[PDB]
Amino acid sequence: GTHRFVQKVEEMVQNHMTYSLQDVGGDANWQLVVEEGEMKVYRREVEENGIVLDPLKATHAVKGVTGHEVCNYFWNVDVRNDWETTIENFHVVETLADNAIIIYQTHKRVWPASQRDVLYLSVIRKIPALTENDPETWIVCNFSVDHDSAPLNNRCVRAKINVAMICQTLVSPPEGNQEISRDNILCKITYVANVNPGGWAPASVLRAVAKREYPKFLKRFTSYVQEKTAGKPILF
Ligand SMILES: CCCCCCCCCCCCCC(=O)N[C@@H](CO)C[C@@H](O)c1ccccc1
């Protein structure tokens, strides 16, 4: 890439590829707090100076869609309002490259506290597979940056985030005369969110809200991808 954020991008992608994919089922620092179908949501309870920082990690398996398609839909701001429910307003501050943009958005008051805004670079990347026996990996990384055109606000507390949707397509070609259809593909998703609320709020409530809102998002967003891609040619 040309843009000034290319080095930071690579470091964020690499951290997610090494630390975010790590299996969290047997990790006793993590707690499985939501299960429904193929979806599991885990959290690690962390606070600094009384501020709840709990890392969130979800895993999902979604039939009939690819990692490329799920990542495309997650990244593409032209469809954000089709699925996102926690945002009041957003706009693109800057386009850095064809796969990378900076976004400013304000969120609905889902917490018992001042309204939050966030200012993040959103980038979509493909990580090639080492062999044709393995899945290619598609990732969208959303991470807080600074921008002159979006300074701190009077009205909102500036949250900071480090989020990744990491997706891999598994395929199971059919036995004989049939061509591959969407019944033969499944997308494995890992979604990780590390959110700094930028100020204090009761932890009990913040945790209740995260337990509610992330599984809600994931079900609605993945369903939306399934609907919008149904009966379409598969994008690997
Ligand atoms: C910025 C803190 C204010 C929101 C408080 C938490 C609400 C839970 C949101 C669940 C849905 C996450 C959807 C999600 O991942 N959304 C994208 C696109 O809007 C931006 C994102 O990477 C993010 C993650 C987490 C918080 C805000 C924004």
Curated annotation (Swiss-Prot):
Residues 9-230 form the START domain. It is found in: Cytoplasm; Golgi apparatus; Endoplasmic reticulum. Changing W111A: Reduces affinity for membranes. Abolishes ceramide transfer. This is Ceramide transfer protein. Changing N142A: Reduces ceramide transfer. Widely expressed. The START domain recognizes ceramides and diacylglycerol lipids, interacts with membranes, and mediates the intermembrane transfer of ceramides and diacylglycerol lipids. Interacts with VAPA and VAPB. Interaction with VAPB is less efficient than with VAPA. Interacts (via FFAT motif) with MOSPD2 (via MSP domain). Shelters ceramides and diacylglycerol lipids inside its START domain and mediates the intracellular trafficking of ceramides and diacylglycerol lipids in a non-vesicular manner. The chain holds residues 363 to 624 of 624 of the full protein. Changing Q105A: No effect on ceramide transfer activity. Changing E84A: Reduces ceramide transfer. It comes from the Eukaryota. It is linked to Neurodevelopmental disorder with hypotonia, speech delay, and dysmorphic facies: An autosomal dominant disorder characterized by mild to profound developmental delay with hypotonia, delayed motor skills, impaired intellectual development, poor or absent speech, and behavioral abnormalities. Some patients are non-verbal and non-ambulatory. Additional features may include early feeding difficulties, poor overall growth, seizures, brain imaging abnormalities, and dysmorphic facial features. The gene is CERT1. An N-acylsphing-4-enine binds at E84, Q105, N142, Y191. Inactivated by hyperphosphorylation of serine residues by CSNK1G2/CK1 that triggers dissociation from the Golgi complex, thus down-regulating ER-to-Golgi transport of ceramide and sphingomyelin synthesis.
